Amino acid sequence: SGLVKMSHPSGDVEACMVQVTCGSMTLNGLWLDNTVWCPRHVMCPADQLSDPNYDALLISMTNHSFSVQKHIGAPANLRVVGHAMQGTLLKLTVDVANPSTPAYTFTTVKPGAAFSVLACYNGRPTGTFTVVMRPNYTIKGSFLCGSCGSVGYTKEGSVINFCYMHQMELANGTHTGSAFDGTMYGAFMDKQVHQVQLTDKYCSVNVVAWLYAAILNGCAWFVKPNRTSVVSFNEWALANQFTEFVGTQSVDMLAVKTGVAIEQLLYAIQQLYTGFQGKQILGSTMLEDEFTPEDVNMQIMGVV
Amino acid sequence: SGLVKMSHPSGDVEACMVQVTCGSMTLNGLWLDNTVWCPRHVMCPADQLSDPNYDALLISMTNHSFSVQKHIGAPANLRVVGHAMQGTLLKLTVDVANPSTPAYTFTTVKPGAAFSVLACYNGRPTGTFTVVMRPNYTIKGSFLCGSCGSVGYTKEGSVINFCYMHQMELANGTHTGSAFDGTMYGAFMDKQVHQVQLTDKYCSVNVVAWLYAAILNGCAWFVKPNRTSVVSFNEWALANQFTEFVGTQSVDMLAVKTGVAIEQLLYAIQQLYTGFQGKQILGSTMLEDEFTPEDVNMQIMGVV
Ligand SMILES: *C(=N)[C@H](C[C@@H]1CCNC1=O)NC(=O)[C@@H]1C[C@@H](C(F)(F)F)CN1C(=O)[C@@H](NC(=O)OC)C(C)(C)C
Ligand SMILES: *C(=N)[C@H](C[C@@H]1CCNC1=O)NC(=O)[C@@H]1C[C@@H](C(F)(F)F)CN1C(=O)[C@@H](NC(=O)OC)C(C)(C)C
């Protein structure tokens, strides 16, 4: 038992991290098969970051403008034999296929979904943590200068689903990056100009999963017979900075195991959102929305 | 910027995990050089777990009573050529030295200290998270059947300091394990009998580090000129379920960078411990004590 902020083991992804350098700029890249992905702003001089012309930067480069080095594990310098831009990312083709390429897919995550991040500097992993894609299409990470190209991913069995490449910090503790189609989460621009963000909201479905996790760990003081329908809750949520609730099979399994209906926990949220009044749930005095239904099913019941 | 629950990259330790089987019992072990460490209760039949005689169990075993298998990465079956007991752990000598043994030390952590845990089942890593050794010598983990032998560790540079091998769950979400001298944290017995725990307390020095992290991320509404001396705070702490505060160089660096004295934050704790009254600090409505001064210095300032 117990519910914690859990990340995937990072070793499989550590074996794919490289350092990418373009002139005076350096960051991290992801080496899969014969391709190295990295943020395109590695091509931009500091003095042009406020108004880059990435199309012009790209044509000013040759294959030799990029240097790709693997430091950790099996060391190596990889020769770039091709270069292309896709959205906010570069795709560098290298002459050697990564012998440690895992089974992988590329996916784009949705608000409320959780993924593991491997934070790296100079091609060297330094930490791992789990984030939730916020309703305003940012993440609340921990990233310093040089962290771009750090990757986020989920895992289904042995398959790694890469979903995030770190790009920028929009405000204190507020970050965004690209999916591997090159689209920036939240459509923010990789240019150094202030860009307003939407207000953050509570992820209602994750709050429900966490309340179920509480029931499963012996904490149910907030469960009453009262119920609020999904439709009624969703009108309320839009007026109170909560996301609209969408049920899933994963949530249904928790309702079955506990015998507590989703609608009872929606009612509870409407009472608890103003404060627990000295009471606590799983050691917290506020609603927690960083645990997904899938995370709860996995940690508490072993079920995937 | 940003402060999150961060763990070390786990790849170096993943390469050291094995499965250890003794009869009908199986769990994880740690393979370093020619030694495999694992919990001694792998020798105990389920029907004797409430009153084991580990000295008698050990003499009833031969080297062949243990089977050690590595599943992930470089697979292998390791032949046991020696077996010994140290405290609550077994030390099995195997015929092959782990070619991926990192530089390592063994250390015993203190309340308030944080470490990374690699949770494993059947010799296969499944997740990683960071815990703090609680003042009552438990950890708040996430562990299911089969998780014993999962390891906790810190890292100083490239050196891994192993400090924890998972042994048991004492209550919901409440865990303990061994240091690698074989001593159980909190002196709990590896026998299946209820064992009372001391009450948990807030780790005051980590609360101070987190308040400094708040100041560094633009949040200082709780800072006032008022001060409380360490001596005065420590008498108060013993009456209010807080640990006694011990300053360190790591804390002093945060006081210097922010210009806010430790004694100002000790006063703040005495006002905030009853509730923030609708206000928030780093997105929380309660004091947080899972971030150490070292963690804060590292994540926010890059400094080790
Ligand atoms: C990649 N190494 C960094 C990561 C950034 C550094 C501080 N904390 C982080 O997460 N990425 C950048 O520096 C980008 C690159 C430039 C651009 F995005 F291409 F324009 C500027 N970057 C920013 O992150 C800026 N943020 C911003 O302009 O938001 C509108 C700041 C943080 C001002 C450099
Ligand atoms: C190792 N695989 C497990 C881990 C345990 C399982 C449930 N969640 C966990 O963290 N360890 C055990 O099952 C130990 C082994 C026995 C003994 F410690 F050697 F006696 C019993 N174990 C327990 O954890 C028991 N806890 C206990 O008796 O506390 C006093 C329970 C959880 C009742 C099996």
Swiss-Prot record, chains A, B:
Q: Which reaction does this chain catalyze?
A: TSAVLQ-|-SGFRK-NH2 and SGVTFQ-|-GKFKK the two peptides corresponding to the two self-cleavage sites of the SARS 3C-like proteinase are the two most reactive peptide substrates. The enzyme exhibits a strong preference for substrates containing Gln at P1 position and Leu at P2 position
Active site residues per record: H41, C148
Which residue numbers delimit the Peptidase C30 domain? 1-304
Q: Which domain of life is it from?
A: Viruses
The task this protein performs is described as: Cleaves the C-terminus of replicase polyprotein at 11 sites. Recognizes substrates containing the core sequence [ILMVF]-Q-|-[SGACN]. Also able to bind an ADP-ribose-1''-phosphate (ADRP).
User: What is the protein's given name?
Assistant: 3C-like proteinase nsp5
Protein's organism: Middle East respiratory syndrome-related coronavirus (isolate United Kingdom/H123990006/2012) (MERS-CoV)
